[PDB]
Design a protein around this ligand. Structure first.
Ligand SMILES: O=C(Nc1cc(-c2ccccn2)nn1CCO)c1nc(C2CC2)ccc1Nc1cncnc1
Ligand SMILES: [Mg+2]
Ligand SMILES: [Zn+2]
Length: 313
């Protein structure tokens, strides 16, 4: 009860900033998460013993893939922490509980392959879940772990509160399907500009949490350039392996996934920043002004990719 988590000075200060990198010491990541839960939710939110057992079972169900791994889970959780801490009074008690857990669990049991590749492989999950295939699986894995003995971190919630939190988590995890992001942001853009955006309207809150989930999920493009540059290697390492597996099915992959077209990556990053990342953080900053540092960091990384093309690095 009186047992706080306390980080070294550099981490204690820098964890509050959006561009915080959780570092290469895997064994510090559970502690960093509990720290964030304690400050963002409270020391009373979860029974420490059940939370630690939950965290370690979640860790075990993330695979050793180059990008969609345990480090990504905790990285996405930290971006959500920074958003919640900079927007203190906008979110309910159940939302702060749900969203950190949603982020930690959002890529559970990811194999480093897109929904498209599962469909073309004819994977059993593509028959089980026709759209948002991996995201429905990630939610399924979250419920399974919550139901392990001693793992139910929501055990103190009423029946209706429990259903609400699991509904917040389901929608938040489904929203990480980038296919759903484009329409969600356009609707939030129209709602914001016509002045019809209303945070008392549950269907509006749902859309705003969806955009938050995309922002946290893409947050590797909001880090300092050396972090972003090296994380980009990890994501393309998955993309290129998926392209190899497309070639094994007799399908020429898209250039994004073709290791024979590495020269096209700088221009592919420009497209990604202009079409996905900058619009995301722009709409998020309009709705949640204190998230402006994510937009600034993203623009700085776009400028670095423009320098790579101009051969300045
Ligand atoms: O870069 C990403 N995507 C991309 C590459 C190309 C492309 C197109 C042509 C040629 C080369 N590349 N097009 N697109 C758009 C569709 O994903 C990317 N995607 C995702 C989520 C699966 C969507 C997450 C992070 C990403 N980047 C990243 C950069 N830095 C640090 N961490 C991550
Ligand atoms: Mg995902
Ligand atoms: Zn993710």
């Amino acid at each position: 009860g009186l047992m706080q988590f306390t980080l070294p000075v550099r981490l204690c200060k820098e964890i509050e900033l959006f561009h915080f990198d959780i570092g290469p010491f895997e064994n510090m990541w559970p502690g960093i998460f509990v720290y964030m839960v304690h400050r963002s939710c409270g020391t009373s939110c979860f029974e420490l013993e059940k939370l630690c057992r939950f965290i370690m079972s979640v860790k075990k169900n993330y695979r050793r893939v180059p990008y969609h791994n345990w480090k990504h889970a905790v990285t996405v959780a930290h971006c959500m922490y920074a958003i919640l801490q900079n927007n203190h009074t906008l979110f309910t008690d159940l939302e702060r509980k749900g969203l950190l857990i949603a982020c930690l669990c959002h890529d559970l049991d990811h194999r480093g392959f897109s929904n498209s590749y599962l469909q073309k492989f004819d994977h059993p999950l593509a028959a089980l879940y026709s759209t948002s295939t991996m995201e429905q699986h990630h939610f399924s894995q979250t419920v399974s772990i919550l139901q392990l003995e001693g793992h139910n971190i929501f055990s103190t919630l009423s029946s209706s509160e429990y259903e609400q939190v699991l509904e917040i988590i389901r929608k938040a995890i489904i929203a990480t399907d980038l296919a759903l992001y484009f329409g969600n942001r356009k609707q939030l853009e129209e709602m914001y500009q016509t002045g019809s955006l209303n945070l008392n309207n549950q269907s509006h809150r749902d859309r705003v949490i969806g955009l938050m989930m995309t922002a946290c999920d893409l947050c590797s493009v909001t880090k300092l350039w050396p972090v972003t540059k090296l994380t980009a290697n990890d994501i393309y390492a998955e993309f290129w392996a998926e392209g190899d597996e497309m070639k094994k099915l007799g399908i020429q992959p898209i250039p994004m996934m073709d290791r024979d077209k590495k020269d096209e990556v700088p221009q592919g990053q420009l497209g990604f920043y202009n079409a996905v990342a900058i619009p995301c953080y722009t709409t998020l900053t309009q709705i949640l002004p204190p998230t402006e540092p994510l937009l600034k960091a993203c623009r700085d990384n776009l400028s670095q990719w423009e320098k790579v093309i101009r051969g300045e690095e």
